[PDB]
Design a protein around this ligand. Structure first.
Ligand SMILES: O[C@@H]1[C@@H](O)[C@H](O[C@@H]2CO[C@@H](O[C@@H]3CO[C@@H](O)[C@H](O)[C@H]3O)[C@H](O)[C@H]2O)OC[C@H]1O
Ligand SMILES: O[C@@H]1[C@@H](O)[C@H](O[C@@H]2CO[C@@H](O[C@@H]3CO[C@@H](O)[C@H](O)[C@H]3O)[C@H](O)[C@H]2O)OC[C@H]1O
Ligand SMILES: [Zn+2]
Length: 185
């Protein structure tokens, strides 16, 4: 299935100029921001989906992630598969590693308290991460075989919720400027 979801959230800090391009294409140009998440993908995430993308521009200046990003409810979990980043490589409680799509990823968990989620301004949730041990080259067609992540996570006690929300290939930033241009299919 083609992408059917456009994610465009900013906490309102700085400038986040997001363009919803044709098909699965988007771009972001941002300046001195708070937190934001922009991307294209699917209204309902699947654990069996292979996400394809091509990041024609990946130019964070400061903290930004180029990442699969999604949520589940029941329970409320946010998840990431981080392929590249800027000045900050996100880490947490180390769980193990997983190999997928030509890369090796570290597996981490973190928890957020009284923080914004898909359920409100001030909620508590767990975050599951696969973070690539080195930045993935950008500019060619790339794949995230998400089932590999889901399976590794499960084997390390990290179960996703039963009610799947959005699933996008995102540009996320915090306290940064930058430019990205990504197509997703
Ligand atoms: O940032 C932009 C890039 O994302 C863009 O890359 C192209 C993205 O689409 C790719 O085409 C897909 C190939 O596989 C098929 O199954 C899909 O249906 C196609 O959408 C194409 O190969 C990439 O070149 O290039 C322009 C950049 O600005
Ligand atoms: O459409 C917008 C919604 O998607 C938005 O919902 C969520 C708001 O909180 C965001 O959560 C943060 C994501 O980035 C992480 O680093 C932080 O730890 C999270 O707090 C979430 O991604 C959004 O989907 O609400 C506003 C709507 O306009
Ligand atoms: Zn393992």
């Amino acid at each position: 299935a083609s992408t059917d979801y456009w994610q465009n959230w900013t906490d309102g800090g700085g400038i986040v100029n997001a363009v919803n391009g044709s098909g699965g294409n988007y771009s972001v140009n941002w300046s001195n921001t708070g937190n934001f998440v922009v991307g294209k993908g699917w209204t309902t995430g699947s654990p069996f989906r292979t996400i394809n993308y091509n990041a024609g521009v990946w130019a964070p200046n400061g903290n930004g992630y180029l990442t699969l990003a999604g949520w589940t409810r029941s329970p409320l979990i946010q998840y990431y598969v981080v392929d590249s980043w800027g000045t900050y490589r996100p880490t947490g409680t180390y769980k193990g590693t997983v190999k997928s799509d030509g890369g090796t990823y570290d597996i981490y968990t973190t928890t957020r308290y009284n923080a914004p989620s898909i359920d409100g301004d001030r909620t508590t949730f767990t975050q599951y991460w696969s973070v690539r041990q080195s930045k993935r080259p950008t500019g060619s067609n790339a794949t995230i075989t998400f089932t590999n992540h889901v399976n590794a996570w499960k084997s390390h006690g990290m179960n996703l919720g039963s009610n799947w929300a959005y699933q996008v290939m995102a540009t996320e930033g915090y306290q940064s400027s930058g430019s990205s241009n990504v197509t997703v299919w």
